[PDB]
Amino acid sequence: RSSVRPYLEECTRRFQEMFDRHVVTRPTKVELTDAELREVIDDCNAAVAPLGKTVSDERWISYVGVVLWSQSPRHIKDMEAFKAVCVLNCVTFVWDDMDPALHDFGLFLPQLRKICEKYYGPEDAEVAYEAARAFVTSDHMFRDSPIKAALCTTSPEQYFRFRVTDIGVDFWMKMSYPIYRHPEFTEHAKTSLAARMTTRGLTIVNDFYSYDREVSLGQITNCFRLCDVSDETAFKEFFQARLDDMIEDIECIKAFDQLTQDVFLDLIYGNFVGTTSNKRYKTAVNDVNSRIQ
Amino acid sequence: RSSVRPYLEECTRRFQEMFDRHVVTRPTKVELTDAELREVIDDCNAAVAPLGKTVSDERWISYVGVVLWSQSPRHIKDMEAFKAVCVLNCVTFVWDDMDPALHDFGLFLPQLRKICEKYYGPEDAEVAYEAARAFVTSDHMFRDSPIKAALCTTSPEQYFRFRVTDIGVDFWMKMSYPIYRHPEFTEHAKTSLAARMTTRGLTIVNDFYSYDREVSLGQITNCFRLCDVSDETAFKEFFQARLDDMIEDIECIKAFDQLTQDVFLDLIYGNFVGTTSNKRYKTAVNDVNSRIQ
Numbered sequence: 001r002s003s004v005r006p007y008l009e010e011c012t013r014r015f016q017e018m019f020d021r022h023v024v025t026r027p028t029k030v031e032l033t034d035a036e037l038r039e040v041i042d043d044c045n046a047a048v049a050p051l052g053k054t055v056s057d058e059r060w061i062s063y064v065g066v067v068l069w070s071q072s073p074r075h076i077k078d079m080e081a082f083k084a085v086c087v088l089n090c091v092t093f094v095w096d097d098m099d100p101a102l103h104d105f106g107l108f109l110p111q112l113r114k115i116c117e118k119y120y121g122p123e124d125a126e127v128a129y130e131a132a133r134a135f136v137t138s139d140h141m142f143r144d145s146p147i148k149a150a151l152c153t154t155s156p157e158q159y160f161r162f163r164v165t166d167i168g169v170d171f172w173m174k175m176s177y178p179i180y181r182h183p184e185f186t187e188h189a190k191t192s193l194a195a196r197m198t199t200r201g202l203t204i205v206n207d208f209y210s211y212d213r214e215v216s217l218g219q220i221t222n223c224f225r226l227c228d229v230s231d232e233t234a235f236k237e238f239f240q241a242r243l244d245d246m247i248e249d250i251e252c253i254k255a256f257d258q259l260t261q262d263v264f265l266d267l268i269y270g271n272f273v274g275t276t277s278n279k280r281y282k283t284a285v286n287d288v289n290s291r292i293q
Numbered sequence: 294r295s296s297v298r299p300y301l302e303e304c305t306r307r308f309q310e311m312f313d314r315h316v317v318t319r320p321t322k323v324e325l326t327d328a329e330l331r332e333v334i335d336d337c338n339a340a341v342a343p344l345g346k347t348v349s350d351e352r353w354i355s356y357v358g359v360v361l362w363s364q365s366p367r368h369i370k371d372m373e374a375f376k377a378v379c380v381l382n383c384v385t386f387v388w389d390d391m392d393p394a395l396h397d398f399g400l401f402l403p404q405l406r407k408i409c410e411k412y413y414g415p416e417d418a419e420v421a422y423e424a425a426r427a428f429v430t431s432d433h434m435f436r437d438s439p440i441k442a443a444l445c446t447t448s449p450e451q452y453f454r455f456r457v458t459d460i461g462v463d464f465w466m467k468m469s470y471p472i473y474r475h476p477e478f479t480e481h482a483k484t485s486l487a488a489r490m491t492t493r494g495l496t497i498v499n500d501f502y503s504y505d506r507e508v509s510l511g512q513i514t515n516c517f518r519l520c521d522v523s524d525e526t527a528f529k530e531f532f533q534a535r536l537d538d539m540i541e542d543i544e545c546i547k548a549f550d551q552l553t554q555d556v557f558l559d560l561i562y563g564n565f566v567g568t569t570s571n572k573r574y575k576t577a578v579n580d581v582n583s584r585i586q
């Protein structure tokens with residue numbers, strides 16, 4: 001029950017086959033200039049310096065790959081907003097990986113605010129800041145919480161309800177809408193409908209590829225802990241139900257306006273492609289994904 | 294399929310039996326003083342006056358009943374925040390009942406901001422206003438939207454996902470936390486985990502008692518449209534599935550801290566008690582629930 005290794009090839013193949021059928025349009029990776037990428041990493045290092053833990057360039061590149069693969073390049077209008085999501089994504093990844101003893105809100109929240117005020121106008125900066133604040137506060141609050149155990153062990157419905165916030169997709173939407181300046185997208189981001197539509201597609205994929213690391217760290221936030229991964233028949237049943245969940249969400253995403261659904265589907269499919277390419281999501285513990293103590 | 298009247302008595306009885314078994318604590322109606330009720334209704338009339346339609350006192354009292362029944366009186370700490378929620382709930386009910394040709398945002402949004410600035414501190418006022426703005430904007434955007442058709446006709450999971458915003462519970466949470474000044478509750482309100490935990494319990498009850506009215510007005514946002522209510526066997530299997538959903542949520546709510554769960558459960562159970570004594574939720578069309586044209 002400690003590993004999904006036996007299912008790795010087939011589940012990867014099945015994810016891709018599902019995306020080829022239901023999304024069709026391939027995600028595309030954003031290429032940052034060398035100037036852009038050192039500005040991102042500089043800002044990242046400055047923001048986490050108060051917490052006292054060094055983060056290597058290779059670790060930052062592993063965190064940032066998600067942003068590069070899962071945004072929607074055809075619709076990008078504000079690259080300053082794009083760099084903000086790069087920085088905010090990465091530094092909150094450090095926080096997700098940290099022992100809660102290192103979580104210093106008094107030192108870290110000002111740095112998040114500093115990032116938001118650099119890259120966003122005043123209105124957008126407050127929305128992005130509030131969502132960053134809510135994300136790191138939730139991750140901290142729920143470490144060893146009985147609420148988390150209840151929502152993660154009861155049913156898929158309770159679990160994905162927790163993940164709307166905990167995986168950070170609500171935060172992502174609320175800091176990403178300035179990239180696109182698309183009124184419908186902005187409204188769906190601020191109601192969190194955008195986040196709720198994309199939660200299962202992001203979470204099922206992440207869970208599959210982060211399972212071995214998480215169970216080794218005693219982390220319970222993973223939907224495949226709801227099935228006996230040691231029982232191939234039970235596992236494949238559960239995996240098919242999760243594919244069905246993704247498919248229904250994707251088919252409903254296609255009722256949204258064209259630009260909004262492009263972005264939603266680039267997010268889910270791009271996250272999958274970035275995940276299969278990311279050292280973070282291979283070995284259960286390596287030098288880019290080990291717990292920061 | 295026009296009516297759930299045949300199931301009225303047994304469904305009411307089953308809801309109450311469920312709450313007696315799973316919640317136990319009875320909800321409590323808040324008494325307002327005469328001066329308090331008058332301040333609330335005056336504020337309501339001033340806020341909707343720019344839209345041109347008179348709203349009777351009896352209609353306001355039908356709207357305000359949900360707030361009086363569904364808050365958590367033992368935990369109340371700020372009766373100014375309480376009156377704000379009365380007013381905000383009531384005037385956005387008028388919006389919910391309006392033909393969208395009456396939806397003047399330029400006239401109505403400044404009235405919502407004025408309400409929030411009268412009753413809340415500066416931070417709280419922004420949060421309450423953002424959520425009121427998001428609520429009235431959503432109701433308007435989704436009148437005859439293909440998104441709403443997709444989410445309301447596909448499955449219960451897509452439907453309740455829409456209702457987290459559309460029924461107004463996220464808005465309710467984000468304008469009610471100042472009533473309690475309870476740090477945990479305030480964080481769950483701001484992540485929307487509060488709203489997600491309580492969405493099905495509010496919606497299933499509201500949908501049952503507003504079905505006849507909504508079907509008569511061509512309104513599709515009602516989960517019992519997903520089953521053939523003219524088929525007694527199918528209706529009862531669908532209704533049991535919805536009771537199971539409510540029970541699962543309630544049992545998970547009990548994992549939250551004591552005050553938060555009191556508030557969450559008072560909301561779900563109080564909304565039911567208020568619904569069963571509210572003239573709005575009887576006749577398909579009467580003089581407190583008719584469409585405002």
Ligand SMILES: [Cl-]
Nearest residue numbers: 218219220221
């Ligand atoms: Cl965890």
Ligand SMILES: [Cl-]
Nearest residue numbers: 511512513514
């Ligand atoms: Cl409707």
Ligand SMILES: [Mg+2]
Nearest residue numbers: 096139166167
């Ligand atoms: Mg996490």
Ligand SMILES: [Mg+2]
Nearest residue numbers: 096097210219
């Ligand atoms: Mg993690």
Ligand SMILES: [Mg+2]
Nearest residue numbers: 206207210214
């Ligand atoms: Mg993970």
Ligand SMILES: [Mg+2]
Nearest residue numbers: 389432459460
């Ligand atoms: Mg409505």
Ligand SMILES: [Mg+2]
Nearest residue numbers: 389390503512
């Ligand atoms: Mg309505």
Ligand SMILES: [Mg+2]
Nearest residue numbers: 499500503507
């Ligand atoms: Mg209704």
